[PDB]
């Protein structure tokens, strides 16, 4: 029902670490400022995604016990979660309140990014579904930590070690859902269900990127490592 002093400590620590990210306004101001070509949008995305991976690795190393994990499992958790964490952060940003008509222009600008419309449709449906859950900053932060510390990733040698680190975060999130959303008792389950939908962005991620209407698909060395691109 109520958070323990240790849980409040864990929550505030995750929040502090999560807030080191670029502010939503910094991202939306760039997109809303002017209409960019498909070529300019591709480079905006690679710069944003490169910054996201850097901030993600810093957030990940601060997660309690992450530094005690086997080094190869550490890489597996990062590569396994990077795309999902990016889309969860994009969903958070998309759902931030902006002046009247700005969210319509933001949506239209994203649809004009330069990628195939078959990749745009599930993106907006996921963003819309995240939006209806009216998640707090603490829920987005804990869910991001839970996504990173998923023991059910490919090439993980010691799944129990990861499971041990994920369990306290799941416990805090469940309590928060019971506190914040007491009228909706399926809220915690609702949030964990979203994580299964997040995983769908994985398989066709490289394809979505190579579909960008640009002459050259140049990615930064960091993006080549974390994503399945050359």
């Amino acid at each position: 029902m109520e958070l323990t002093p240790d849980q409040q400590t864990l929550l505030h620590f995750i929040m502090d670490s999560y807030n080191k990210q670029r502010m939503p306004q910094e991202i939306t101001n760039k997109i809303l400022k002017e209409a960019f070509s498909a070529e300019e949008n591709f480079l905006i995305l690679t710069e944003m995604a490169t910054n996201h991976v850097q901030v993600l690795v810093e957030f990940t190393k601060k997660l309690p016990g992450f530094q005690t994990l086997d080094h190869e499992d550490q890489i597996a958790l990062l590569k396994g979660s990077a795309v999902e964490a990016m889309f969860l952060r994009s969903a958070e940003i998309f759902n931030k309140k902006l002046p009247s008509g700005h969210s319509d222009l933001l949506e239209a600008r994203i649809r004009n990014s330069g990628i195939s419309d078959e990749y745009i449709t599930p993106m907006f449906s996921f963003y819309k579904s995240i939006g209806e859950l009216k998640m707090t900053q603490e829920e987005y932060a804990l869910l991001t930590a839970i996504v990173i510390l998923s023991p059910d990733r490919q090439y993980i040698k010691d799944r129990e070690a990861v499971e041990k680190l994920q369990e306290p975060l799941l416990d805090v999130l469940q309590k928060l859902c019971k506190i914040h959303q007491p009228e909706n008792p399926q809220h915690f389950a609702c949030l964990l269900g979203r994580l299964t939908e997040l995983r769908t962005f994985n398989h066709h991620h490289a394809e979505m990127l190579m579909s960008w209407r640009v002459n050259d698909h140049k990615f930064t060395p960091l993006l080549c490592e974390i994503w399945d691109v050359q």
Binding site: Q54, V57, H71, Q74, I75, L78, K79, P221, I226
Partner: peptide
């Protein structure tokens, strides 16, 4: 081989 991720994880 993923030396950039390995670098960012092992730095500091």
């Amino acid at each position: 081989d993923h030396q950039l991720l390995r670098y960012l994880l092992d730095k500091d």
